[PDB]
Amino acid sequence: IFVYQNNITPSAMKLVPSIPPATIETFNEAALVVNITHHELVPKHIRLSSDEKRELLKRYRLKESQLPRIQRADPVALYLGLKRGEVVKIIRKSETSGRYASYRICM
Amino acid sequence: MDISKPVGSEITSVDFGILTAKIRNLSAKQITNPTVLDNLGHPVSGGLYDLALGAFLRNLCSTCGLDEKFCPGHQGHIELPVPCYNPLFFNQLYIYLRASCLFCHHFRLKSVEVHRYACKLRLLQYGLIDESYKLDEITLDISSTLLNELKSKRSEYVDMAIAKALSDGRTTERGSFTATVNDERKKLVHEFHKKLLSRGKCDNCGMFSPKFRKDGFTKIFETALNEKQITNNRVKGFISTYILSTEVKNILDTVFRKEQCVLQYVFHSRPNLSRKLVKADSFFMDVLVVPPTRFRLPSKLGEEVHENSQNQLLSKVLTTSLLIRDLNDDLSKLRVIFSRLMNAFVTIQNDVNAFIDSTKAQGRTSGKVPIPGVKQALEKKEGLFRKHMMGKRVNYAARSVISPDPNIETNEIGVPPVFAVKLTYPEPVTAYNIAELRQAVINGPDKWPGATQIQNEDGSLVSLIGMSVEQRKALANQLLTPSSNVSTHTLNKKVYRHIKNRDVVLMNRQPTLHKASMMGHKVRVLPNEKTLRLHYANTGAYNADFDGDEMNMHFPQNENARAEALNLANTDSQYLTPTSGSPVRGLIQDHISAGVWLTSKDSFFTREQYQQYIYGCIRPEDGHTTRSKIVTLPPTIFKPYPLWTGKQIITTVLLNVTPPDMPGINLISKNKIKNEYWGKGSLENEVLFKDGALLCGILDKSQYGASKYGIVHSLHEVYGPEVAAKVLSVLGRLFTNYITATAFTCGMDDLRLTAEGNKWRTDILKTSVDTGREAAAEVTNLDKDTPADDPELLKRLQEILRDNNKSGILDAVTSSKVNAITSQVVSKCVPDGTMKKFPCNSMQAMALSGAKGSNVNVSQIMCLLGQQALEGRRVPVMVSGKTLPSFKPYETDAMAGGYVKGRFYSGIKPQEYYFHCMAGREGLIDTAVKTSRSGYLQRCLTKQLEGVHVSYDNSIRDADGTLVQFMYGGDAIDITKESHMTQFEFCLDNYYALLKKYNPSALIEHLDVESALKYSKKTLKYRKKHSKEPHYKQSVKYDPVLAKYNPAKYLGSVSENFQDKLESFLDKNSKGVNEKKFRALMQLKYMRSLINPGEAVGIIASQSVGEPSTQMTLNTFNVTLGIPRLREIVMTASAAIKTPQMTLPIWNDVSDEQADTFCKSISKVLLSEVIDKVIVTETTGTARSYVIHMRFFDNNEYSEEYDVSKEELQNVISNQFIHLLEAAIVKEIKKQKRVEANNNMNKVQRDRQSAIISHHRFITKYNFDDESGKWCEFKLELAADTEKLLMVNIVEEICRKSIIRQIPHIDRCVHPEPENGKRVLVTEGVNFQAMWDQEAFIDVDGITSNDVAAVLKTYGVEAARNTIVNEINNVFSRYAISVSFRHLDLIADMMTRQGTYLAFNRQGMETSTSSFMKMSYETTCQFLTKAVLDNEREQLDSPSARIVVGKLNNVGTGSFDVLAKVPNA
Amino acid sequence: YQRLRHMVNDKFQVRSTGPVNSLTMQPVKGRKRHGGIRVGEMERDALIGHGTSFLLQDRLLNSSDYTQASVCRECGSILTTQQSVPRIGSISTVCCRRCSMRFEDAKK
């Protein structure tokens, strides 16, 4: 995690995937002021390991690309460090029914 | 369609593709003669009506040899001699032409950069997106042994990436194309065509090619190349003419041979298992095809025949192909022969351009272009794809004007004998219907219970029209004789009988805004009638008023479609609406106003009267009883004269239509009629049903009208939809025969007050003579009742008139004071000061019962009209102060402003007759602008959500398989089932009747019982251990029981909100029924109230936003409202909302005093807003000088209103303002060549001036009030060369531009009234990054905008989804309209399905699979071009795709298959 | 009282079957010429909303322009087929044009 202050050099942002095994995830410390996952409208997000991604896609018999999508540059996907292919579990406070689990894949 | 002719084969999928120039194997007609006809009308050989193209004019076709009614027609081809380009694919040949190198003949991009997009678009044709980004992981004057090593290694990953997913169950041999797979692929090809198109020179050759430039879709010009570029070409690889289109072909046929690794994946979206080659001939038309003769028959008009339009631009092609055929021989037997030839290519290109498109070709350019061509035959609202595929015209249908009837059933229609002797049904004759179908042949076409045709087993018909009785009686005995033919021995005959009383019928109206405007009525054939005839319970579902409306009547023609208008689309199952579960069906006016008389306490009936009202409504012959005998009650008075009561007739009609095994109905409800209207200590507002007996209270609209939780809505829940439709039919006949025996009338005495109550309103309206002045004397800020003609009040009222804001303040104070006098009269006179009272007054009884009208209408008849409010204001007023020429100018009167103290009983005066005509017209111009507001909003909702449906795993999925939700609303409950679900007292009163409805005896041996009850008690106990925790600190041990267990299989897997309600009932109450055996009822009632798989919840959700929005269309009574708001959320998904806001919750310690100080530290302050005056004294002489003097307000005024200190005015005037002013004085000089005074400053004030003289152009002097801030001062000098300038009108514009202090993207912050305790601050403009630094004031964890594109940008995609459902609900809750959250959750989950905010439009439709949904929506021949270039296989699974191919739809009855278990091996 | 001039004597139509349009094989438009009732775009969506796929099938395919066409399985086309013109001792049958190599192509 690399917390910059105002920006990074554009020649230096070409070197963010320059380590292929280890990822570099860069944040602006003005955008880190409020934790967005404490907001009332952001539900609880839980990343799923591949023994419950696979049991999700067995229960509903889905391809990976048939789930609802979360972007790679989403504010909560940059928060949790969601790689492409990771399935997050959202616990929504539904109006008619209370707590309600929903899923969403990162592509 | 005949059911005796099955079809074994059917179409699964449709491949798009391009016809090659080998139409020669298809077409051997060769249409070359441009002459079409001759003398004596024979079609010329070779011409465009050639008889090898189908039979024509009683001839036989030269190819198939069949007549005009058996020939299909055949396709001939026009040989074009030169390859004119295909005008659909011109924009994509001009992409691969602009990106090619003419010297390398590869491209103008590096051979490994082109290889990378050949390698990412290959991983995307298989269903794998993760590996196409990890191709960019594989990297490390470079020699080619490394660039062939990078090529040989990326191709090794793809062989490993495919053969891993292809060895697993992830992808197939034909790929795993989806919607997001299409999204990523539509981005790379849009990016591959962006890196090809912008490069200058060839990275593979170094030499390079000139730059092409085109015109409006006719010509390619190879532009000349300047000598600077040639000098690079001569040194590198040597170690504007029109281009003839055979040379554009030889370039692209050389490009595509080399680039066959990359273009094999750009043009193919699924894998290319036929392993064809992307050839260059696909973009140029070597030949044409000509559609067959049947598709080109002569288009007559009036009573004369004219030539077809599509031959008029296909002969103009064919003369020009004859011109060029001769002139090629003119050149070859040996100038002007090329200018005669190149000019011919200008028009043979343009004529085939005009043949396909029409807006492409200019041509004559005189207007009204003929022959619209084959694109304009497809693209319009009409086109071909919306007027003849998505909508059609049908056989076996009728339409007619409808007329009321209370004597037919509620589920019936009255069919005239005009329609009855026409509409027929192919009934197959068998052993059981032969007794009825012999008589139909003997009756024949004349009598109604008859036939018109019999169909034999060879398919041949026999009409029964010209026959007589002896022919028809003979044939009728031959219906079961077997044929001698053995090929048709399976079949039987089919009599086309007339439509009987056991048929059904779909009715309809012209705006079919929801699915209860098309329902399954049964048929009753009524003699002596000429109009269709409909019961009153259907008048609210079709939104029908009986004033000459026509209804379309559809008669379905097989047993499959009959069983669905009986069971699914019938009127009995459409009792509750799918919008919010409200009932839509009930009795209307004379039935509402007879139940107040029948069930009154005065209504006594003798014995002869009692049995006449029971049998007059309930007949055992027609099947209304349940006991095969009419049962009665003992009278409620025995001895003096035996009498029944009117409430006791209602008990008898429910004792005969409800089944005898179940117990009675137990209901405790209310009425609309108050307990003081009936007298002293009455209880007739309380409706009590005990054991099916009305014991108390009259019946109103609230009970058997279209109203929830009454008696008809409660019999629907306990007894079922069939009983509640019989009860409306019985009551519709009971209150009709009661009205016939005992009538209802409205008179002139029903409209009259008594002599004391007329005196009351004369006193109260006398107290309004001062009211118009009291509100006038208030707004002017005078006091203590100045007289009306006071010359200082008239000065102030004239100022109010000249300003639009101040006039509405006068109108809002005065319309709030005369409406106090209005409601004092009505509160004194309407219920109590009348002459005839409610158990005889019909005008009051019609409004209390809800029969017709309201008490606002009764009060205008009887007391006064009141304030006539116009555009949300009062009466408009002339320039002269006058509101009419009768009144005095600036007349402070209520009546002069449009207050009517007259009433409709005594008449209204001519002045106030004129103001009431003003309010009558503004309600009619709004209807002039409201005839279709929401037509395109509902259409565009209903096509994205067109195949969204409940699946058998209860997951809400789209038609192509892509998941939208995981349950319907998170509980999977139908809206039309949830109505008495949280009514726990009603279900306990009716425990033993709901127990044999939701029958658990023959139920529980199929379904697991004790597995989800055990898990829910784990979670419920655990969800109480974490109540006070915030939502981010919540547990993840226990996801809800609905996620783990199917609610339709496991008894007890119930939503966590219904679980909390049933526990809160079973604890706060304690009432021979246990609480343990009451859990088992409601948990089973949840299990039987679930949505069914195959429910089209996508169409329903679109109909539940579109149909209640036609109500949502009114004008002014700040924020965007109504349909113009809902065309921003749902449609177009704008990032530029007109009025974006932000809602800021404030803490506990910060008071309202400190919040108002906080709003003044956010709201922007212009320097305009702190200036009283600007004095600009211009002088000349010496240099034109300019002395700008600024009067500010008092320092304790702008540093109270605006929170701007006078040390902040200095830092804006010196730093910002003068640079803006001197920018505009210079900018005018460019266009020009084309009181008190103070002095004696000290050293602080002197050297501040010295910094400003050195830092601006023409300033030289400056001062500021550093004592009080009341004034500023600076003295510009310009040259004498300059002329007169309006310096004030530059200062007025720069002072209105210079901000003092603006927090960015935010204009204003306001402190509104706290609703529901929510102390909030509303902020005109969105910037979440600014409001996070205000954490001592604002609860930053609870701030919420309406700009969804901003909440998506900052708080993720799940917060944007929440912002959608609360901004659609705020649109509907503002007009008091309720839609379910299940419909709003399904729209926000369709917009945020890509992690973005997609509109319902053409651009949000691009991320979708089915091409026919795109073609049928709009821009038909742009999605068609995109589908052919993609080589896209239509899988035929959206409901707009199946109608094109003529396939059974995949929703509801088509969501499964029926298979027949045959006994023998 | 009064009596309004427009009357219901010429308003309505019934149709069981009748004339068509030759491009589409769909019932014609017209009150006089026994024309059909239009089941348009909005009336189609009411039939998808009820879930009844056979009332949509009947009101769009069966009662409008149902045909049993002939389609080649090999090339997947409708308009390229043709009933053959037989020998006088032969029964005619359905044959595809562009799936057919003509007889002066005896390749040896």
Swiss-Prot record, chain A:
Localisation per UniProt entry: Nucleus
Transmembrane segments: none
Domain of life: Eukaryota
Its biological purpose: DNA-dependent RNA polymerases catalyze the transcription of DNA into RNA using the four ribonucleoside triphosphates as substrates. Common component of RNA polymerases I, II and III which synthesize ribosomal RNA precursors, mRNA precursors and many functional non-coding RNAs, and small RNAs, such as 5S rRNA and tRNAs, respectively. Pol II is the central component of the basal RNA polymerase II transcription machinery. RNA polymerase complexes are composed of mobile elements that move relative to each other.
Subunit structure: Component of the RNA polymerase I (Pol I), RNA polymerase II (Pol II) and RNA polymerase III (Pol III) complexes. Component of the RNA polymerase I (Pol I) complex consisting of 14 subunits: RPA135, RPA190, RPC40, RPA14, RPB5, RPO26, RPA43, RPB8, RPA12, RPB10, RPC19, RPC10, RPA49 and RPA34. The complex is composed of a horseshoe-shaped core containing ten subunits (RPA135, RPA190, RPB5, RPO26, RPB8, RPB10, RPC10, RPA12, RPC19 and RPC40) where RPA135 and RPA190 form the DNA-binding cleft.
Recorded family membership: Belongs to the archaeal Rpo5/eukaryotic RPB5 RNA polymerase subunit family.
Name of the protein in question: DNA-directed RNA polymerases I, II, and III subunit RPABC1
From Swiss-Prot, chain B:
Keyword Cell inner membrane belongs to the record: no
Main location group: nucleus
Region listing for Bridging helix, in residue ranges: 910-922
Entry-annotated residues carrying Phosphoserine: S807, S1438
Enzyme class: transferase
Example of a GO MF term: promoter-specific chromatin binding
SUPFAM superfamilies named among the record's database cross-references: beta and beta-prime subunits of DNA dependent RNA-polymerase
Protein name according to UniProt: DNA-directed RNA polymerase I subunit RPA190
Protein species of origin: Saccharomyces cerevisiae (strain ATCC 204508 / S288c)
UniProtKB/Swiss-Prot annotation, chain C:
Sections of the chain in a coiled coil: none
UniProt signal peptide: none
Localization, UniProt: Nucleus, Nucleolus
Zinc fingers, C4-type class: 72-99
Origin superkingdom: Eukaryota
SUBUNIT field: Component of the RNA polymerase I (Pol I) complex consisting of 14 subunits: RPA135, RPA190, RPC40, RPA14, RPB5, RPO26, RPA43, RPB8, RPA12, RPB10, RPC19, RPC10, RPA49 and RPA34. The complex is composed of a horseshoe-shaped core containing ten subunits (RPA135, RPA190, RPB5, RPO26, RPB8, RPB10, RPC10, RPA12, RPC19 and RPC40) where RPA135 and RPA190 form the DNA-binding cleft. Outside of the core, RPA14 and RPA43 form the stalk that mediates interactions with transcription initiation factors and newly synthesized RNA.
Family classification: Belongs to the RNA polymerase beta chain family.
Misc. comment: Three distinct zinc-containing RNA polymerases are found in eukaryotic nuclei: polymerase I for the ribosomal RNA precursor, polymerase II for the mRNA precursor, and polymerase III for 5S and tRNA genes. Present with 14100 molecules/cell in log phase SD medium.
Known function: DNA-dependent RNA polymerases catalyze the transcription of DNA into RNA using the four ribonucleoside triphosphates as substrates. Component of RNA polymerase I (Pol I) which synthesizes ribosomal RNA precursors. Besides, RNA polymerase I has intrinsic RNA cleavage activity. RPA190 and RPA135 both contribute to the polymerase catalytic activity and together form the Pol I active center. In addition, subunit RPA12 contributes a catalytic zinc ribbon that is required for RNA cleavage by Pol I.
Record protein name field: DNA-directed RNA polymerase I subunit RPA135
Lineage: Eukaryota, Fungi, Dikarya, Ascomycota, Saccharomycotina
